[PDB]
Write a protein that binds this ligand. Sequence first.
Ligand SMILES: [Zn+2]
Ligand SMILES: [Zn+2]
Ligand SMILES: [Zn+2]
Ligand SMILES: [Zn+2]
Ligand SMILES: [Zn+2]
Ligand SMILES: [Zn+2]
Ligand SMILES: [Zn+2]
Ligand SMILES: [Zn+2]
Lengths: 258, 258, 258, 258
Amino acid sequence: TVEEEVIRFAEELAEEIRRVTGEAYREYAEAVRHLGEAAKAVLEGNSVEADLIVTDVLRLLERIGEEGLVKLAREVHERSFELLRKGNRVEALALILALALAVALTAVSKAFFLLGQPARLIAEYVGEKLLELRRLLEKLGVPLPEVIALLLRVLEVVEESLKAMGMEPREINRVLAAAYLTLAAELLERLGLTALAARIRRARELLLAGRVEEALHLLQDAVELLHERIRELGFEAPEELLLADLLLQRALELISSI
Amino acid sequence: TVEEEVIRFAEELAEEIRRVTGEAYREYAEAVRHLGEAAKAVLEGNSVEADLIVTDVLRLLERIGEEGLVKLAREVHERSFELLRKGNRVEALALILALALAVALTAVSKAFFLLGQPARLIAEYVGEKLLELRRLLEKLGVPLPEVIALLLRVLEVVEESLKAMGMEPREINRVLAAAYLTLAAELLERLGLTALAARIRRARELLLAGRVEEALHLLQDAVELLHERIRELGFEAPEELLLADLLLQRALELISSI
Amino acid sequence: TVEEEVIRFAEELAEEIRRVTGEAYREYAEAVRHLGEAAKAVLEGNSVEADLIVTDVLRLLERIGEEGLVKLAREVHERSFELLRKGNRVEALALILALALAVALTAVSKAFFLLGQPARLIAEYVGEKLLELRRLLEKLGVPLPEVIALLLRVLEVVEESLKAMGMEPREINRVLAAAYLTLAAELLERLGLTALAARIRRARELLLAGRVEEALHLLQDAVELLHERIRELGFEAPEELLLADLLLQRALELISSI
Amino acid sequence: TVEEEVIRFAEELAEEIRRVTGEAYREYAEAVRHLGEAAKAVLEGNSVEADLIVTDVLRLLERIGEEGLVKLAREVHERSFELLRKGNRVEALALILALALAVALTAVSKAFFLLGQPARLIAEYVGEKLLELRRLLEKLGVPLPEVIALLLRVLEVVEESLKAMGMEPREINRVLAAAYLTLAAELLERLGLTALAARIRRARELLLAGRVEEALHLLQDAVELLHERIRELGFEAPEELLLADLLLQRALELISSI
Ligand SMILES: [Zn+2]
Ligand SMILES: [Zn+2]
Ligand SMILES: [Zn+2]
Ligand SMILES: [Zn+2]
Ligand SMILES: [Zn+2]
Ligand SMILES: [Zn+2]
Ligand SMILES: [Zn+2]
Ligand SMILES: [Zn+2]
């Protein structure tokens, strides 16, 4: 039904915030439910109530005090207003869902860092949530490059929040690299390159266990073989290969900077 | 089977710690599983393996650094050794389960306070866990006064941990009063005095909402009615009435000191 | 028709603000009319426009600069959103009306204190407005304990505003005690205890005239006789007696602290 | 029989510490014999005696004062407890054997450095002991990647001990590179690439004789040829080649840092 998937995504995201944290972070759950209501409103035709709800969420996040989240909220407000005036329902829905996921991941990461959890669980949870959002957006109809751009925007927001809170840079780089690696592994696996995806997952697992250099070399070998495949295909290479290559290069940079 | 209830209690307690916190507090889950293994060893006949496991748990708790919980662990060690040598299996099992519950509640309260949770959720969770332990101990066969003494021992451990962590006294008093109120309400309801139990629950709910004086007066009126019933019954008053009266007096003093 | 009563209540409240003050306090009248529009919107089925209007009122009160009023507005926003999502129309209406009455009483009390009016007329006006709100809520269907909790929240907001403005504590205690006394007198009279209600009104009148100790003793005698009646009834005492007893105890505390 | 190999390994390891050192390092032999007793207990079915013995070994190593060894002991304790509860006998046995080898190698390396021995004999002894452990684990049934991870854990413990004791970094890098080189040479030889293994051994021998740059270039040429073979095979490359490549890269980094 696709729409029911969006409403269930919003409700399940709010319930996941409640399960992970409880009532210590309730403004985030309120904002996520508001964004779900806005996404529901978009799907029937009402385009002004969506703008009003997005402005309400912007006020809530401004009261919360997360600079990157507020910036993303302003950008979503402007782009969603313009697209809804023009008639691009799908991209406005994608922006609303990306904002909701960004708020949820910010709350979850803040709770995990305050508790004192290691970077492994944060990395797996962020990767799983990004995978769920990617599947939802692909079911909706958003083109893949825009989906990847939205996911990178969400990851940028999460990284900014973690850096501002006080986390040491190495752990932030580790979790961002793990998220990029799982995204790239999913992208490669979708195209049928199961062994390459398995190698990427092995590299991610070795990275999360403290074995940095071994994961670095595994990733470099995977990158070289991906380049061989891409340049053998020619100019008919599906966008999955190029997006996975870019994500792997970002992961290489982040892992090297560790 | 009663025993299966004991091992399931230990495993479910560990799983609840994992659900509430995750992997940020893993030594507590290790200690709870060790105490569950000790309780399983006691029920089979082996009395020295239980002592060795309790000593291992004591070492783990000494490494953790929770002074009151270590004190409780030492007392459990001594009493369990003496009772198992004599042959009091049930009381040793009760002490082991009380220690496990104390560790679990200490971990949960520490996580909740670190997050920034309100006192309401802590109060309800502590009350529910104490109720589960009380039902298990009553099913085992421990006499009621000893069960209650163990419950206030666990509550004293939790209070000491909360004071040492840095919580303001008023919230600690509020959660202690809520725990005593729910314990007394269950004790009264077991005897059939459902209206008095309902009044006690109303007093607890008004206390948790910040309405201190109204809850104080409701508790005082309930105390006078309980005294009237107790002095009408005479010397044939079941132990439930006396234990509930003592718990209500402690809750009254705690609420007054708020 | 009940609904027409709500709309007329909002309009009459705004007109009463205008009559008492004029155009010196116009933001309060604007907020009251906005809340009346929200209450009208709730009653047809639209639950998002109500949230948007409540957020608008929150912004208006944040610009006004009344800390307690803003806190009550935030709490009303959250609870009304949750209840309207679940489907509790009546409690959302009650919260909106309580917020409107709180704004109106804050404006009226500020005007009366700025003019230099004595506490007697302030107390009578506050009591009359609380009585009107109580009758409206009882006609709507809100359970009595929740109505009393809402009225106490409104009184807390008014007390906080008066304390922050600069009023001497004795007059604030006097007006709060008078409001509690008239509420308790109405509650007792509804149950048929006309003579007890008359004694409570006599105590309130002696309190407002400066005769503090005589009113204190009259109230203590009324409290003792109410306790006699309550403990003679047993556990079948209607909620009116218990709520009146709690209100009388709060009045006793406030009068003693004078 | 496989098990008899385990007890003989423990006893022969303890006898080897006695032969190399004598009675100057007796706590290490005590710990190794305790770990052998734990390994014997695991293979018989008793899973709590193993935990008690591992805790005893942890106390012994805490008294000794080797921080890395204590850390490895704690990790082995936790992982072995969890796996034995689940039912993974083989991995718990592997962890116990890895801890025993780590203690033995730490004692031997400390004695060798205190005497003033050159790095060559230390490197050969460490390589031989790691080879024996690898053969034992492969006979048991542990998968190769986990065996290699355990071997680098042991090597990390030894390296940390050497750094903390006072050895100059260059000799530590030399011995670690030699150990990695012999491990990779054995891994390559197992697959039939005997000439590549011979070249790796030649590089190790040139490294141990002070000829650093020649060994560096020989290793680089071997790495390029191994990469050629790996990329010629494709995705059907046995895990031996990938693990050898990772080990060779770590050895290359260590040699370059010399
Ligand atoms: Zn707008
Ligand atoms: Zn390679
Ligand atoms: Zn003992
Ligand atoms: Zn009373
Ligand atoms: Zn809202
Ligand atoms: Zn009198
Ligand atoms: Zn243990
Ligand atoms: Zn060459």
